[PDB]
Design a protein around this ligand. Structure first.
Ligand code: F6C
Ligand code: CLA
Ligand code: CLA
Ligand code: CLA
Ligand code: CLA
Ligand code: CLA
Ligand code: CLA
Ligand code: CLA
Ligand SMILES: CC1=C(/C=C/C(C)=C/C=C/C(C)=C/C=C/C=C(C)/C=C/C=C(C)/C=C/C2=C(C)CCCC2(C)C)C(C)(C)CCC1
Ligand SMILES: CC1=C(/C=C/C(C)=C/C=C/C(C)=C\C=C\C=C(C)\C=C\C=C(C)\C=C\C2=C(C)CCCC2(C)C)C(C)(C)CCC1
Ligand SMILES: CC1=C(C/C=C(\C)CCC[C@H](C)CCC[C@H](C)CCCC(C)C)C(=O)c2ccccc2C1=O
Lengths: 65, 137, 80, 46, 139, 753
């Protein structure tokens, strides 16, 4: 995935499991969870962004243009 | 056939209730209607049985009317909510009613049963199980 | 005493350490996140179980978890 | 005046208007046709 | 022994109890640029003196709250230390542990109670029946 | 020069733009809703002005404008009462026959059979019997026709419009500075001499020139149409001369200090008017004139602009050791010094004090209004008397709880430790443990030695051992001090010997001196006190002390405690500080107010139950030609109220027959409201007993169901917050209980009153 891509979350314990988010940035280093995903709906803590690894995301729409 | 229920006009207790009534707007014509159309028990009060092939319209008419009204309200709400999803700020449209959108939703929901059948046939009525947020098992 | 665990989803935002009212947590060097630091709980004997750290944690789900265990004088927050 | 019109579209205001209209309709139905009961709707007055 | 002068305080009912002399006690020491009024952790107002101040407290949370929410946040005092004093006179400086505030990352600090997985991969308790290990403590 | 008027011109433009921006006053709420909690937060923080901004001047301007708005609301309500008394009442028929007509000022429409609620109230009128006492008030004021009530309603509407315009003007056009609001001396002078004093003077003038002559004619028995209009009593001085001869001498005795010649219309009789059962209107006229003089004198106590007067700051600073009394020097060498800053900066402390004093005033109103009925035909209108007493008792309890709550709010938010160094507030905070421990011990003592004694009475009666019961016939507990006070107050007027010779009749017949009957019903008679009264008064003491314990523990520990030392940083209103330290649920001062609401409800329910039962049992009743009094419940209170089985049977079960059998009658609405209050109490039980996690997970499942059909809302549904759930529970609980008691009382006293 890359910036602007639409993803479906596969992390089971995540508030956005099987929900749709938008990739804001991908970290190029070797950190455990480099992808940053923003969501339209907030979780129970009021947070609408999270960090995920590539294997926890399913790309559903390519970035525009 | 049910024998414990007889027409209210032939029930002595219902007749006593009719005579003992106040003479106001609320009692005269209602009692005339109940005597003509209702079935009364031994207590003299109208009872509503669901065991008669006849007067089946008396059961189906209110049920159908309520089902139509409730489906109209539900379809209006659902169509409005689905129309507001494409917006940038749907929550603002849920605290601020978008009048043209609501009017369009109501006008379309006037024919809600046919639209619901069409949506069910085309698979547009429901979302698939894997695109719905769920808790861990 | 209570048990405080830190999972690899920590982003090193230091909020849990700041939120702790009894200095149970501290930031230690790490390489699993961009901030290059991770939370740690070397002093869980002083943990009262208030779960302020969990409230302060921004990750989803929580990167820090508190499991209430055996109760001691200081874990019950007793001044007597 | 446009701000007033936008205020009139608020969820509480619209809900109050809808409830008032429905209550008025039901009240007028009670006044015009008192004593309507299941098995009696849409039937001629005896 | 711990050096410092106690703040001006007329007494109160939120002070030390039998636990202080029987089990343990805490002491918070700091240095202020001037004499000024602060709030005692258990109610009331005290006057901290210009030199080095020492305050006896019953719980570590009192000292943490006083040092963080009042000394640093309000009075801009950063040199406060919290010691644990036992009835036999043994004293250990417990805050800050290594001279650096815990919220600031410091080299040499080891990882304690770290789990090398996300929280959703904890095993189910049915796996560890009669084994005595909790799911969060599982390897 | 120091006291002066300073304002800002056009500080806030008058535009409706922010009407379309809900939550604009709060930074968090301004961004719009993301969850349903946003709506509840918007409604909960609407009037918390000190969280809208940190500027005290803007806060004070908001207070002033909102007070004008509330005054407009009150004026609208008063205008509505007067208009309904002028247009949809039997007021004229009631004035014709006060003792044989039930007051009624509410008429229902006939659409769904609710016209059965139009009770036959006499005078050829069908309507709901009112218990507000408006008719007696209007009769005491000299009002005799509906046209005057209509004029008063129009004036009330005009006053409401004026108040609304005043609020708009003083917020959006000319907003006073913060310095204007901080003029304690000028405000006190103007509100003592100009508000209370001048209002008392004006009402005394209205009474003397209008109320006394009209009511004297009414009590003389002349018809309404033959009584001239009030203005005729002013233009034609001959009417004044005929009714009160002293009026023939004009104002000469007043200016020559020969006031004794005015004794014909400024009397000092005491007692009650035999014709009506209310207080003598000339007595009340002299009372209000004396109040006017005293308040005007008090209004020249504070120093504003001419050197003369006392200063709040100097007086507060002088009240400390060693300037106090020798046994009062424990308040320390600082004493009240530093308290002036509280009144400089804190609105919440003033609101707390004023709510407490409003509760005190309402309690005094209830007691002194049942004991010395001030209105004609009020004492014999039993339903009205009970309703007034209960209503004002409940208002007082709510006001006291609010005072405690806002005291806690001041402690959390406005209290500054630097302002209070070894002063009385600091010392109180420093021995709060002493205070709370002693209060808890005395609460336990009172609970045992009242309620456990009631349980002892229950068990002894069940054993068939009445001789072992705490009763007038067993082990007696005579309230000797209250009896002694009754005897002293009776002997003071001549009915420790004659310490008040000037009053002819007893000040109140409840203390003794005789009985007054009006229409064959008792207006007031001596209220004897025995073992049951001792027990019930100590029950009241126990309940009040426990309510004080809850509220005062909340206030004293608002900043923190040994458990959570930093509660002040957590705020006034927060759910908890986590399950740690064993569990810190409901530690906030708001939760203490939440519990104090329940305890106040309990205490006031017992107070009103005691009043109702004792009045029905020992005072109210009917008098035959021979002077023998038969009471409503026939003297049950002495033997039945000493056990709570007696309360369950002879008060709750027996006296609920009216409300429970009110179906198919004009009182059926009271039975419906009885059931409604029971339902609301049961409904509140789930908000009180449950927690929000369960409801959040259930909402999760329901949201899944809505998502399956593409009908889920963007504003995400959330369970109510913990504090919100507690607030909903307590609100519904109090509403249900109070409505149940209201329906019970009103049905019983409309049927048999
Ligand atoms: C569920 C349940 C239930 C049910 C079921 O079903 C019912 C029903 C009944 C019936 C049968 C009758 C009539 C019918 C009609 O109207 O008809 C016409 C119309 C049409 C045909 C049609 C119409 C339609 C519509 C218009 C539509 C719309 C609606 C809406 C939506 C609603 C909602 C709205 C809101 C409310 C506002 C009645 C009536 C009565 N009610 Mg009774 N309900 C109940 C409930 C209730 C409650 C809660 C209470 C209390 C408040 C009461 C009350 C009352 C009174 C007073 C009275 C009278 O008078 C009447 C009579 O007479 O009787 C007989 N009850 N109901
Ligand atoms: C003699 C002068 C005087 C009088 C009568 C009042 C009266 C009042 N002030 Mg006030 N005030 C005064 C001087 C005065 N003030 C001064 C000098 C200051 C500055 C130090 C203030 C500062 C002040 C503040 C900051 C606040 C008040 C508030 C109030 C109201 C309290 C609510 C109440 O009891 O309802 C009484 C109910 C009534 C119906 C009383 C009548 C109301 C009108 C306005 C009285 C008009 C009387 C006038 C002489 C016309 C009479 C005509 C004819 C009968 C002779 C009350 C109306 C509070 C309020 O609610 O503000 C709106 C409030 O927050 N006052
Ligand atoms: C002079 C009277 C007065 C004034 C000016 C205030 C002013 C204030 N109070 Mg306060 N209070 C008062 C009396 C007063 N109170 C009394 C008598 C009590 C005891 C019950 C309280 C208890 C109280 C608490 C516990 C709290 C406040 C708070 C506040 C502040 C925010 C107001 C708020 O939340 O909006 C009110 C907004 C609402 C949504 C309330 C309306 C809902 C009510 C409960 C409905 C009542 C039911 C209805 C009357 C009958 C049934 C209706 C029917 C449809 C069924 C504000 C400074 C809050 C705060 O944060 O202070 C800093 C707070 O937490 N007050
Ligand atoms: C858009 C309107 C709408 C629609 C189509 C539905 C549809 C559904 N709801 Mg639901 N619901 C709604 C609004 C709606 N809800 C609201 C506003 C609430 C909050 C009170 C709830 C609370 C709720 C609960 C608690 C439950 C459901 C359940 C259900 C399901 C079956 C039972 C049922 O019909 O609800 C019955 C209806 C209610 C319980 C209350 C809804 C009545 C509201 C007040 C009508 C609102 C109309 C709306 C304002 C129209 C505006 C449109 C306009 C702008 C054009 C079904 C999928 C149940 C479920 O999961 O079944 C499997 C269930 O347990 N709903
Ligand atoms: C606290 C204020 C208050 C309250 C609770 C009421 C309550 C009521 N009014 Mg009322 N009213 C008020 C103020 C108030 N009024 C004022 C200030 C005026 C003067 C403009 C009126 C003038 C008025 C009229 C003219 C009528 C009512 C009527 C009514 C009843 C039905 C109202 C309705 O259908 O809507 C109801 C008991 C109606 C009524 O009682 O019908 C018999 C009716 O016809 N009201
Ligand atoms: C000591 C004060 C006092 C008392 C005892 C009375 C007594 C009376 N008034 Mg009156 N009145 C007062 C002050 C008082 N008034 C003031 C200040 C005004 C406005 C300026 C009025 C305006 C007024 C009108 C317009 C009318 C009456 C009427 C009446 C009679 C009906 C009963 C009643 O109102 O409840 C009695 C009230 C009480 C027992 C207690 C309330 C009095 C105040 C609130 C006490 C405040 C003290 C407070 C708790 C402590 C403050 C703190 C402290 C540090 C100072 C009765 C004789 C009516 C009438 O004509 O009678 C036939 C009537 O129509 N009054
Ligand atoms: C505070 C309000 C108030 C008002 C507006 C009035 C107004 C009036 N009084 Mg009055 N009066 C008042 C209080 C008041 N009084 C009180 C408190 C007393 C008791 C001391 C009196 C005792 C009194 C007497 C004895 C007389 C008046 C009279 C009058 C009228 C002519 C007075 C004049 O202009 O000289 C005038 C309508 C005179 C009059 O014309 O009688 C109707 C008259 O003879 N008054
Ligand atoms: C009928 C129910 C009931 C009872 C009995 C109590 C009893 C008590 N509550 Mg309580 N409470 C209740 C309902 C009740 N509450 C509810 C519904 C609420 C919710 C609002 C609260 C909220 C509440 C608060 C917030 C507070 C209390 C407090 C108290 C204590 C007051 C001191 C006292 O009276 O000691 C005397 C004890 C009694 C009168 C209890 C009855 C004793 C019986 C009659 C005699 C027993 C004889 C013997 C000892 C039995 C031994 C035999 C053996 C086999 C066991 C007391 C333990 C206060 C407290 O702790 O005080 C310091 C306090 O702060 N309660
Ligand atoms: C408690 C309450 C209430 C009420 C009550 C009342 C009723 C009150 C009243 C009050 C009042 C009743 C007040 C009054 C005031 C007054 C005033 C304030 C006046 C003034 C005056 C003046 C100022 C004058 C002047 C003059 C002239 C004009 C000319 C010549 C000169 C002279 C100076 C003489 C209610 C129920 C509603 C509600 C709840 C609470
Ligand atoms: C005969 C009859 C009866 C019975 C009946 C029955 C027994 C039935 C059944 C039924 C059933 C067994 C059903 C099922 C169903 C299922 C399902 C699955 C459903 C679904 C639905 C939906 C999906 C909907 C949707 C919608 C619409 C369309 C509109 C509005 C909106 C909404 C979205 C809600 C009775 C006696 C009662 C009465 C008389 C008659
Ligand atoms: C029941 C309950 C809930 C669930 C309640 C919720 C989510 C509030 C629901 C409010 C509704 C949406 C308001 C509207 C209700 C009206 C009756 C709707 C009228 C509709 C007209 C058409 C008649 C909690 O969230 C909760 C939280 C904490 C402690 C206890 C409880 C608790 O007891």
């Amino acid at each position: 995935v890359e910036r602007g891509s639409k993803v479906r979350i596969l992390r089971r314990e995540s508030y956005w499991y099987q929900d749709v988010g938008l990739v804001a940035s991908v970290d190029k280093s070797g950190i455990k969870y480099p992808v940053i995903v923003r969501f339209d709906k907030v979780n129970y803590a009021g947070v609408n962004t999270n960090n995920f690894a590539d294997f926890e995301l399913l790309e559903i729409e390519k970035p525009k243009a | 056939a049910n024998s414990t229920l007889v027409p209210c006009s032939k029930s002595p207790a219902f007749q006593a209730r009719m005579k003992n009534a106040p003479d106001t707007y609320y009692f005269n014509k209602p009692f005339k209607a109940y005597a003509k159309y209702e079935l009364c028990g031994t207590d003299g009060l109208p009872h509503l049985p669901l065991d008669r092939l006849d007067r089946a319209t008396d059961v189906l008419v209110p049920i159908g009317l309520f089902l139509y009204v409730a489906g109209f309200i539900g379809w209006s709400g659902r169509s409005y909510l689905r129309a507001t999803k494409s917006a940038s700020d749907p929550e603002m449209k849920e605290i601020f009613i978008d009048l043209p959108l609501a009017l369009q939703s109501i006008s379309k929901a006037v024919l809600w049963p046919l639209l619901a059948l069409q949506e069910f046939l085309s698979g547009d009525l429901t979302a698939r199980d894997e695109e719905i947020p769920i808790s861990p098992r | 005493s209570h048990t405080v665990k830190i999972y690899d989803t920590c982003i090193g935002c230091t909020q849990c350490v700041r939120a702790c009212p009894t200095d149970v947590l501290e930031m230690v060097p790490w390489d699993g996140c961009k901030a290059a630091q991770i939370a740690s709980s070397p002093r869980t004997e002083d943990c009262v179980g208030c779960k302020r750290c969990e409230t302060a944690c921004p990750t989803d789900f929580l990167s820090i978890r508190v499991y209430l265990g055996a109760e001691t004088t200081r874990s019950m927050g007793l001044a007597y | 005046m446009q701000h007033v019109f936008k205020y009139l579209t608020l969820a509480p205001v619209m809900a109050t208007f809808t409830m008032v209209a429905l209550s008025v309709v039901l009240i007028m139905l009670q006044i015009w046709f008192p004593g309507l009961q299941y098995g009696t709707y849409f039937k001629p007055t005896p | 022994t711990l050096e410092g002068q106690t703040p001006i305080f007329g007494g109160g009912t939120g002070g030390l109890l039998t636990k202080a002399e029987r089990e343990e006690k805490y002491v918070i020491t700091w240095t202020s640029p001037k004499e000024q009024v602060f709030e005692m952790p258990t109610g009331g107002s005290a006057i901290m003196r210009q030199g080095k101040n020492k305050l006896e407290i019953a719980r570590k949370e009192y000292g943490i709250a006083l040092g963080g929410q009042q000394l640093r946040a309000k009075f801009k005092i950063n040199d406060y230390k919290i010691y644990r004093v036992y009835p036999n006179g043994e004293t250990q400086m417990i805050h800050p542990a290594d001279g650096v505030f815990p919220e600031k990352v410091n080299q040499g600090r080891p990882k304690v109670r770290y789990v090398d997985r996300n929280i959703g991969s904890n095993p189910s308790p049915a796996k560890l029946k009669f084994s005595g290990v909790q799911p969060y403590d599982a390897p | 020069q120091k006291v002066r008027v300073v304002v800002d011109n056009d500080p806030v433009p008058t535009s409706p733009e922010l009407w379309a921006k809900p939550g604009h006053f709060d930074r968090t709420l301004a961004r719009g809703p993301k969850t349903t909690t946003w709506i509840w937060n918007l409604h909960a923080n609407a009037h918390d002005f000190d969280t809208h901004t940190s500027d005290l001047e803007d806060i004070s301007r908001k207070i002033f404008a909102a007070h004008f708005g509330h005054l407009a609301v009150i004026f609208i309500w008063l205008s509505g009462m007067y208009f309904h008394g002028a247009k949809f009442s039997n007021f004229e028929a009631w004035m014709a026959n006060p003792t044989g007509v039930k007051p009624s000022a509410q008429v229902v429409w006939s659409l769904v059979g609710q016209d059965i609620l139009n009770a036959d109230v006499g005078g050829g009128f069908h309507g709901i019997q009112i218990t507000s006492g408006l008719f007696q008030l209007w009769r005491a004021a000299g009002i005799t026709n509906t046209f005057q009530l209509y004029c008063t309603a129009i004036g009330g509407l005009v006053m409401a419009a004026i108040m609304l315009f005043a609020g708009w003007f003083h917020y959006h056009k000319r907003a006073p500075k913060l310095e204007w609001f901080q003029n304690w001396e000028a405000m006190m002078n103007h509100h003592l001499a100009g508000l209370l004093g001048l209002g008392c003077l004006g009402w005394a003038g209205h009474q003397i020139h209008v109320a006394l002559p009209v009511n004297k004619l009414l009590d003389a028995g002349v018809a309404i149409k033959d009584i001239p209009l009030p203005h005729e009593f002013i233009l034609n001085t001959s009417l004044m001369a005929e009714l009160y001869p002293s009026f023939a001498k004009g104002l000469v005795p007043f200016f020559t200090l020969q006031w004794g010649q005015y004794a014909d219309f400024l009397t000092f009789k005491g007692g009650l008017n035999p014709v009506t059962g209310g207080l003598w209107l000339s007595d009340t006229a002299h009372h209000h004139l004396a109040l006017a003089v005293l308040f005007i004198v008090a209004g020249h106590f504070y120093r504003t602009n001419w050197g003369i007067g006392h200063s709040f700051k100097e007086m507060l600073d002088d009240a400390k050791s060693p300037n106090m009394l020798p046994f009062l020097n424990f308040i320390g060498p600082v004493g009240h010094e530093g308290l002036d800053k509280i009144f400089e900066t804190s609105w919440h402390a003033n609101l707390s004090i004023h709510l407490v004093q409003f509760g005190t005033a309402s309690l005094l109103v209830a007691h002194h209004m049942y004991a010395m009925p001030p209105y004609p035909y009020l004492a014999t209108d039993y339903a009205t008397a009970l309703s007034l007493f209960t209503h004002h008792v409940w208002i007082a309890g709510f006001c006291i709880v609010g005072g405690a709550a806002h005291a806690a709010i001041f402690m959390v938010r406005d209290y500054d430790p630097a302002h209070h160094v070894n002063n009385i507030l600091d010392r109180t905070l420093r021995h709060r443990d002493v205070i709370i421990s002693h209060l808890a011990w005395v609460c336990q003592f009172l609970g045992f030695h009242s309620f456990a004694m009631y349980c002892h009475n229950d068990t002894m009666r069940a054993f068939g051992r009445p001789q072992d019961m705490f009763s007038d016939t067993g082990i007696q507990l005579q309230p000797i001090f209250a009896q002694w006070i009754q005897h002293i107050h009776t002997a003071a007027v001549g009915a420790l010997g004659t310490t008040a010779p000037g009053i002819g009749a007893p000040v109140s017949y409840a203390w003794g001196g005789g009985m007054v009957a009006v229409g064959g019903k008792v207006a007031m008679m001596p209220i004897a006190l025995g073992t049951a009264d001792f027990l019930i008064h100590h029950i009241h003491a126990f309940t009040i002390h426990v309510t004080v314990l809850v509220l005062f523990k909340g206030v004293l520990f608002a900043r923190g405690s040994r458990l959570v030392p930093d509660k002040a940083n957590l705020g006034f209103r927060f759910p908890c500080d986590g399950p740690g330290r064993g569990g810190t649920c409901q530690v906030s001062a708001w939760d203490h107010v939440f519990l104090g609401l329940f305890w106040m409800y309990n205490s006031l329910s017992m107070v009103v139950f005691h009043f109702s039962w004792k009045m029905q049992s020992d005072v109210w009743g009917t008098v035959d030609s021979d002077g023998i009094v038969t009471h409503l419940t026939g003297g049950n209170f002495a033997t039945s109220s000493i056990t709570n089985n007696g309360w369950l049977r002879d008060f709750l079960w027996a006296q609920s027959a009216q409300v429970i059998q009110s179906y198919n009658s004009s009182l059926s609405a009271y039975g419906l409201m009885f059931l409604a209050g029971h339902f609301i109490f049961g409904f509140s039980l789930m908000f009180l007993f449950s927690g929000r996690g369960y409801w959040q997970e259930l909402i999760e499942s329901i949201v899944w169901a809505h998502n399956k059909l593409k009908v889920a809302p963007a504003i995400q549904p959330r369970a109510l917050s913990i504090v919100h759930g507690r607030a909903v529970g307590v609100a519904h609980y109090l509403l249900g209980g109070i409505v149940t008691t209201w329906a019970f009382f009103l049905a019983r006293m409309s049927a048999i009153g």
